[PDB]
Structures are given as C-alpha cells and as structure tokens.
Amino acid sequence: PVEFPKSLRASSHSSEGGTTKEEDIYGYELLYRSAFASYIAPTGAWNLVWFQAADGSIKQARWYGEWVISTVLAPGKALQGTPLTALLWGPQDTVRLYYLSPQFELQEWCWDTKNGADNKYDGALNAAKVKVAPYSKLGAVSFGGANLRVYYQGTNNKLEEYTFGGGQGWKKGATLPGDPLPGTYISFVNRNKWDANPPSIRGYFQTVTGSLAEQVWETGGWRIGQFVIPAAPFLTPISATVSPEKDFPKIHVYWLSVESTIIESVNWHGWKAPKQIDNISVVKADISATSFTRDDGTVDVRIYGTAQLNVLFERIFRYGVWEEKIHSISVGKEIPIEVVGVAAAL
Amino acid sequence: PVEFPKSLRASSHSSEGGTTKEEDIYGYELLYRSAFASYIAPTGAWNLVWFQAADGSIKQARWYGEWVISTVLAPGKALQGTPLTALLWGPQDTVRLYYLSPQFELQEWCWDTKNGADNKYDGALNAAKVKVAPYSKLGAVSFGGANLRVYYQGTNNKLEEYTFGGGQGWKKGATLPGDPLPGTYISFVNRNKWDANPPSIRGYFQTVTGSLAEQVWETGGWRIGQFVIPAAPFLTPISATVSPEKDFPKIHVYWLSVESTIIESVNWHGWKAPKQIDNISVVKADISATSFTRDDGTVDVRIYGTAQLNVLFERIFRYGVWEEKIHSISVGKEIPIEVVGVA
Numbered sequence A: 001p002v003e004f005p006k007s008l009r010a011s012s013h014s015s016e017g018g019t020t021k022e023e024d025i026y027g028y029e030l031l032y033r034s035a036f037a038s039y040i041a042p043t044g045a046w047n048l049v050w051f052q053a054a055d056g057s058i059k060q061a062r063w064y065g066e067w068v069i070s071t072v073l074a075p076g077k078a079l080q081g082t083p084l085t086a087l088l089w090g091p092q093d094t095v096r097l098y099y100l101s102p103q104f105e106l107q108e109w110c111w112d113t114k115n116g117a118d119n120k121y122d123g124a125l126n127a128a129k130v131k132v133a134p135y136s137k138l139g140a141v142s143f144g145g146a147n148l149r150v151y152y153q154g155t156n157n158k159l160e161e162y163t164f165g166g167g168q169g170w171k172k173g174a175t176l177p178g179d180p181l182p183g184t185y186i187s188f189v190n191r192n193k194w195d196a197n198p199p200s201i202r203g204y205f206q207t208v209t210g211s212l213a214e215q216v217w218e219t220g221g222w223r224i225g226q227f228v229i230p231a232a233p234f235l236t237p238i239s240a241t242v243s244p245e246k247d248f249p250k251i252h253v254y255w256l257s258v259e260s261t262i263i264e265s266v267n268w269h270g271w272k273a274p275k276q277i278d279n280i281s282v283v284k285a286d287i288s289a290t291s292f293t294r295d296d297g298t299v300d301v302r303i304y305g306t307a308q309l310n311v312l313f314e315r316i317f318r319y320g321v322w323e324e325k326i327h328s329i330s331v332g333k334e335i336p337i338e339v340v341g342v343a344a345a346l
Numbered sequence B: 001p002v003e004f005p006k007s008l009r010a011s012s013h014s015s016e017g018g019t020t021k022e023e024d025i026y027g028y029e030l031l032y033r034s035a036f037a038s039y040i041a042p043t044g045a046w047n048l049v050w051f052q053a054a055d056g057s058i059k060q061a062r063w064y065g066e067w068v069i070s071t072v073l074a075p076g077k078a079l080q081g082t083p084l085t086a087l088l089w090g091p092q093d094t095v096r097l098y099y100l101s102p103q104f105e106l107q108e109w110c111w112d113t114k115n116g117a118d119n120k121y122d123g124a125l126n127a128a129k130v131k132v133a134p135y136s137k138l139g140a141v142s143f144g145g146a147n148l149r150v151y152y153q154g155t156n157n158k159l160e161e162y163t164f165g166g167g168q169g170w171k172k173g174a175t176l177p178g179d180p181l182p183g184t185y186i187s188f189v190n191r192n193k194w195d196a197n198p199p200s201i202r203g204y205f206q207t208v209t210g211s212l213a214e215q216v217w218e219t220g221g222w223r224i225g226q227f228v229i230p231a232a233p234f235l236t237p238i239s240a241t242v243s244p245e246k247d248f249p250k251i252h253v254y255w256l257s258v259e260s261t262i263i264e265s266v267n268w269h270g271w272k273a274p275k276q277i278d279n280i281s282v283v284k285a286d287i288s289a290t291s292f293t294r295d296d297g298t299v300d301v302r303i304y305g306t307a308q309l310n311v312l313f314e315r316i317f318r319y320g321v322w323e324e325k326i327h328s329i330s331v332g333k334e335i336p337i338e339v340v341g342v343a
C-alpha cells in the first residue's frame, strides 16, 4: 500500500479519527498538482473547469447534467505546471482562460458563443508578449462587459495588472501595493455585476511574511485591505469567489491549513472568522472556487482541486450546507491503490 | 509567519520536539521542488550537483573548496519540472546529464574535459527522439568506459532502457520486469567499477501497489530483486548510490517517510533494516545521493534535495556519522521567513 499520515483523513470514506485502511484513486492522466480554473454559469445551469493533463495539454470539464471532457489547448501551448484563471461574461456567453507559455509569457484562450457561435481562438493578449516571473500565478476580473484585468507577478515580485478595454487594446496597468511572496497564489474577484462600471475589485495573496493579505480597488485607486490572516502555510493555495447574497456581495476566500484541509473566510456585512469546511486533507495544490446566486437570493459555491491520491474533486455548497458527498471527475486512466494510515517514520 | 506542523522539525535548528518558532530560508530562484542530479568525484576532490532554476534553465553547483554556480542548459531546453540524472567516468573527466525536452523526449548534455579540453555539447541521444511518459523520471549507469544505459518510464508505464556503446550508437534496450507506479521516482546504480565489464546493475522504483521494488541485471537478463519495502508514501522520492567498502559494493537506498524524513537502507553483505538518518522533514521532492570510497577505505555519502522552505540542502555522511548541522547551497536571491509550529 501507500503510507498516509494516520492523523489525517485521505477521503470521505476515511475513518472518523484519521486514515486506517482504504482504497483511493490515482488518476495519472491529470498532471500531478494541476492548476485549476473554473466558472459556474450565473444561472447555475452549467459548469466549466479547466486543468492540465499529464501531457501538458489544457483540458476542460463541462457539466450540463453530466461531465464531458474536452481538450482546449494542445501540448506545447502551455508551460508544464502553468497557472490558470478564467473569465465569463455576456452574462454567460463569452469565456476567457489565461495561462503561461513555456517562455513565461501571458497567454489568452478565447471562447465566444454569442448568437449561437462556437469560436475558440487565441486572444490578442498573446501579441503583447508580457513576460512574468516564472513562478507567477494568475488572476483576472471583467467589468462593464469586456473591460478585462489580468493580474500576475512581475520579475521583481510585485503584483502587476494588464488592462483591456475602451478600444485601447492590451496595455500595462497598475503596479499593486504590498510585498507579495515570490510564487504566491493569487485570486481576484469583482464584487460588482459583470456589466457594471466601475468594478469593486478584491485580490487575495500571501505576503513575504507568510500572512494572507488583500488587494482592494475602488474609485480612487489601489490599497491594501482589511482582510488579514497573520499566518498560513508556505505557498498555500488560495482561491476566492464572490456572488450577491440577498443583494449584497458575499466573498468566500479559501486556502489550506497545515493539515491541507480547506479553510473558508466569508465577507458579507463584515468578515467572519475562518472555519474549516471539512476535515479531509486534499493534495497541497491549486484549488479553484466559483459561485452563483439562486433566484431566491442564496449563494451556491463549488470548489475544485486535487484530492488523494490524484483526482479532480468537486465540493458543493448548496442551499446553505456543504454536501457530505464529495464528487470526483474522471479525466482519464486511473488505478486504485490501497492507503494505510501510519503514525511514525518506521 | 508561515505555519508548519508542530510535530515536525523544519530544520536542524528546530526545537527537539518539533517546530516552535524559527527563521528559515526561501531561495526563490530555485525551482520549487526542483529535480536534482549529482556526482562526487571518486577521489572526493570535488562535487557536481545539477538542478533546475526558477526560469527553467539547468544549473550546476560545483564544489571545489567552495561552491560555484553556473548555467549548463539555457532556459527553453528542458521541460519545466524535468527529471535529471548524471553519469561520470574516465575515471572523472567525462560527464553526461540526462533530462527531458519540453516535448518529453530524452535529452543528453555532454561535458568532456580529457586532456584539459572544455567541450560542452548536446549529445547524440537527442537524435533518437525517444518520447517517454510525460511524468517519467530518469536513471542511468555507465560501464566499460563509454557503455551507457538510460532508464525511463515508457508511455505504457513500464520501465525501459536505452543503450549506447560498442560503436552501435543509441539503440532501444530491454523492457524491464515489474509493474511501476506511473510517475515513480527511479534510481539506478552500477555495483562494479566504471571501467569494468560486465556491469552489475540495480534499480529502485515504486510499484503500482505503493511498495518499493528493485531491478537486478546480471548476465542472463533482468529480474526483480530481493529489496522489498511493502509500503511507502505515494510518489516518494527515491535515490540510490553505491561505492565499495572493504572491496564489496555498499548500496545506499534513500526514500522519504510519511513525515518527509529521509529513510536509508544499506546493502552490504545483505540488506540492513531501514533507518531514519535524521528527523528533519525535507520538502517532499526529488533527492539525489552520491558516494565515494575514501582512501582510508570508508564510504562517504552526500545527499542533495530541497529543505524548508526552498533551499538546496547537503547532508553529509563522513567517517561513519551524519553531520548534524545541515547547510544549504545558495543558488540565487533569498528571503528569510519566520516559521511557527501549529497543531
């Protein structure tokens, strides 16, 4: 079997007090510790998840009653281990996926479906040849329709913005405040509606001290926000999502504990205390959260990431509860492996 | 600060019972979880270590009285996250480094220093365009001088051999027995001397059950060996090294425990029980062991890998003990970060 820390739970079917003996799945055509991007439709009708396959291609899992896997970028387009982040607007017919080339330049994949179209193409951002720090992660927001903002880490480790819109093409934007950890995970959200202008932008990242910190844009410019987590694991995955709950933006910020369990902080008429959403240890690797508002004003959340041993998980927050069933989305060939909980080195 | 599990030690200056509060180093120009290859001179006179920088270039740390960093492969030559494995013979004037291209093909870097030359070049293995499983690791041995064997994981997840020597050029070699875990770390050694022929080859890998297993080549072909670890962490790093002690090959096999501490098993007139060499948790990432036989007859070992938070460590086994203060080799810019143990 494979050994796993006895005090940790590897899966939903682990013993209550940790892992004893169980079977878990190795999906070996998913890149180990793949990046993830995701977007659930604002109606909740369908879901998009993007990830990197073992061969380096970028693939898409689409849910509409069932999951369907497709390939959107061939091997060689993306850095092996590329970060990923996605945009969706129109309200829900125009999709963008940002990634890095093998030369560490910003790249953009476009999917346009307005008026019944089905057009996938390389975006204009590719031509700007924007070199980023090789360990940079990526975030992005959209507002006022097709005003786009891409967030990345520059070679001097500051967070940086690239902008699109108003007939200007892609242009360098702001340098953001703060002292980001080199290689920090980053996640940016827009609290205002997709067609509204100005936006209300929040970004979450890890600082050089290990704390989690918040970027804020409102009219008047960028500043460091009030969200402060004084200590977090080194290079902890971070993902945030926002959707209005009872007409007020509800931010969910997720990161990993030292046990690699998922911690959630909610902003909704103030920040609430961080809370572990379940006690199952995921693989310490990129996660991706997305959310939408139901007709009744309540907010659903989905989180995607890597579960033991290497499977694409889906966690579901629906009608006010985290569902106990944690789904897995098969993306290729798999082998089952016995896992045993072990308390010491030998 | 950054949080670290309280029951684990992040460094040799951690508290005895785990991490409480300490300062550790982030070398951010080292690729996080870089692969490592290494070779110490058979005389012990100097050391070579290869690793991947954050920008994807392959760099070399050479110890000759002091550590000196250089670049051997420009950015763009190697897969981001490439495995690495090295050969040294002549006894010590001919170096080969194997890696993967961004298209998952076997590649070879060559460094020839015979007669005071300084020739660095791409090797002929590149022309074979050997496509491997994208998560393949790499091993290699040399014997009889320039007879070379490169080991990798084929697209069907079997371990495979490519061969060089006898004026034949690079040719496909054996398909090895066993059922390897997709993406397993692998490490191959030659128990016989670099100029001897035939070789006595051993390889170490992880199976689809999670066990660790051993490949054996003697005259007659490949067989699965007696080295069996029934359970190990998923995709545990593995590295082995061999050098003679009292005129008998002493194999050291290293892998990581469930606490990411380094476990050692020695073969020297039989296998000895696995032993934790120290109780400091490294980053669960590639390690590289190398060894030489000192002129006094004892066997020195060096292990390289990633220590908290992201530094290139050197662990030293010398005169029969592991030195307790574990130092790092700087490869670029660094930042110190406070680490706190959390339960």
Ligand SMILES: O[C@H]1[C@H](O)[C@@H](O)OC[C@H]1O
Pocket: B202, B214, B216, B224, B225, B226, B227, B267
């Ligand atoms: O595990 C053993 C092996 O079975 C034998 O053949 O040679 C010495 C060790 O490598």
Ligand SMILES: O[C@H]1[C@H](O)[C@H](O)OC[C@H]1O
Pocket: A096, A108, A110, A122, A123, A124, A125, A146, A148, A164
């Ligand atoms: O980069 C552009 C892209 O070419 C697309 O046409 O729409 C707006 C931006 O995403």
Ligand SMILES: O[C@H]1[C@H](O)[C@H](O)OC[C@H]1O
Pocket: B096, B108, B110, B122, B123, B124, B125, B146, B148, B164
């Ligand atoms: O691949 C060859 C290389 O081109 C050089 O001729 O030395 C022997 C082998 O490493």
